[PDB]
Amino acid sequence: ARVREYSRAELVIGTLCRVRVYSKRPAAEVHAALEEVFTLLQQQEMVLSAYRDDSALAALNAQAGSAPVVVDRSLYALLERALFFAEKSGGAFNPALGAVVKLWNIGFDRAAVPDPDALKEALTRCDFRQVHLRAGVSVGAPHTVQLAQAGMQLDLGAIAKGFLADKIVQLLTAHALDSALVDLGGNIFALGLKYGAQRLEWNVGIRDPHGTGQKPALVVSVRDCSVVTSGAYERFFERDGVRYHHIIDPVTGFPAHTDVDSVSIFAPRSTDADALATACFVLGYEKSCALLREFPGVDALFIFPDKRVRASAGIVDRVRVLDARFVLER
Numbered sequence: 001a002r003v004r005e006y007s008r009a010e011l012v013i014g015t016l017c018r019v020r021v022y023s024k025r026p027a028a029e030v031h032a033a034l035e036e037v038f039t040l041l042q043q044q045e046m047v048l049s050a051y052r053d054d055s056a057l058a059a060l061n062a063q064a065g066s067a068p069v070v071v072d073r074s075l076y077a078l079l080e081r082a083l084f085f086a087e088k089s090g091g092a093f094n095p096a097l098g099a100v101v102k103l104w105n106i107g108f109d110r111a112a113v114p115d116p117d118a119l120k121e122a123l124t125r126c127d128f129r130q131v132h133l134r135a136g137v138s139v140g141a142p143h144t145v146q147l148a149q150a151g152m153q154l155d156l157g158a159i160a161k162g163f164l165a166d167k168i169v170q171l172l173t174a175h176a177l178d179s180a181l182v183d184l185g186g187n188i189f190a191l192g193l194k195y196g197a198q199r200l201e202w203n204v205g206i207r208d209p210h211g212t213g214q215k216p217a218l219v220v221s222v223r224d225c226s227v228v229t230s231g232a233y234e235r236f237f238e239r240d241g242v243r244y245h246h247i248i249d250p251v252t253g254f255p256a257h258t259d260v261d262s263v264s265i266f267a268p269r270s271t272d273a274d275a276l277a278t279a280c281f282v283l284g285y286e287k288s289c290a291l292l293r294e295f296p297g298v299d300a301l302f303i304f305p306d307k308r309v310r311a312s313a314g315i316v317d318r319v320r321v322l323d324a325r326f327v328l329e330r
């Protein structure tokens, strides 16, 4: 049996999603797996999306301040993990920030900053501790979510791509695949090893925060690892000489003012890397380092505005600088 390399990519969940596979299985088996990957992404866009009016999440948000809503086990599990990271990060990551994000989401569309009293009012409706998850213990008991605070809105944008990458890895493994690179709008999962007959680590690129996105500034060699990066210049608009990016500091209600240009988290679960990258960007370097000591199975790489790069002990020897303007501190 010969090794063959496959890739497929589609526009879905508002971005470019690509999966690359190396396999010795019959091509028809790989094709079926990839068909299912992209069907999964279409289906889950309709479960998780905060943009669409017809999503499961949109329906849940429509019931804020009312009775508990039945959800599938998968959505319940994601919400549980999101609330876990909200608690651990002191709300730096907050999955109930929809009231505020929606004010800034219309700002992006109109290139305009939201009113101050409006933002202050919005922040009163973002207490994630008022998201109540309950699941009975008996056979076939339903999973439920209640949004106790009137007007509160879930927004899972900062954890959903991680969740989907993990679901895709589980699907690929179910199809007896063990070598893939999953890339959901830059949210990466490196499954197994690639092929050169030699097996090699995947070389995951991390962009210049101010780059045009084309070329990586750095590459990191990894196996069985997610790599997720949060940065200011990922998504922003400008008004009167000021840049407003998409990652909100829940204390201020404004885009976070932080001491790093990007943070990349390396974790065995992409769900976790995705939530932590957002939290760490909001928290800044020193507080991120404190948070990450609570997760010894995770590594991190910080790119500072002065182009210094600091990486934790578990990955620093795996980092190669490609753009010599950047310096890896050792």
Ligand SMILES: Cc1cc2nc3c(=O)[nH]c(=O)nc-3n(C[C@H](O)[C@H](O)[C@H](O)COP(=O)(O)OP(=O)(O)OC[C@H]3O[C@@H](n4cnc5c(N)ncnc54)[C@H](O)[C@@H]3O)c2cc1C
Pocket (backbone or CB within 6 Å): 013, 014, 015, 044, 045, 048, 049, 050, 051, 092, 093, 094, 095, 097, 101, 155, 156, 157, 158, 159, 160, 161, 229, 230, 234, 246, 247, 248, 249, 250, 274, 277, 278, 282
């Ligand atoms: C199912 C799904 C469907 C999507 N559909 C569309 C679409 O139709 N059109 C489109 O343009 N984009 C779409 N997106 C992308 C969407 O805009 C997300 O906001 C984006 O994936 C997050 O970008 P990020 O990973 O770089 O940053 P992250 O840092 O991982 O997430 C930032 C996002 O999380 C929210 N957020 C901001 N601050 C915080 C905070 N402190 N804590 C927690 N959350 C915060 C906001 O939604 C923000 O956009 C979709 C994403 C998903 C997951």
Ligand SMILES: [Mg+2]
Pocket (backbone or CB within 6 Å): 157, 158, 159, 230, 273, 274, 275, 276, 277, 278
């Ligand atoms: Mg994130």
Ligand SMILES: [Mg+2]
Pocket (backbone or CB within 6 Å): 157, 158, 159, 161, 162, 187, 228, 274
């Ligand atoms: Mg993300």
Ligand code: NA
Pocket (backbone or CB within 6 Å): 121, 122, 124, 125, 151
């Ligand atoms: Na209010």
Ligand code: NA
Pocket (backbone or CB within 6 Å): 256, 257, 258, 259, 282, 283, 284
């Ligand atoms: Na800050």
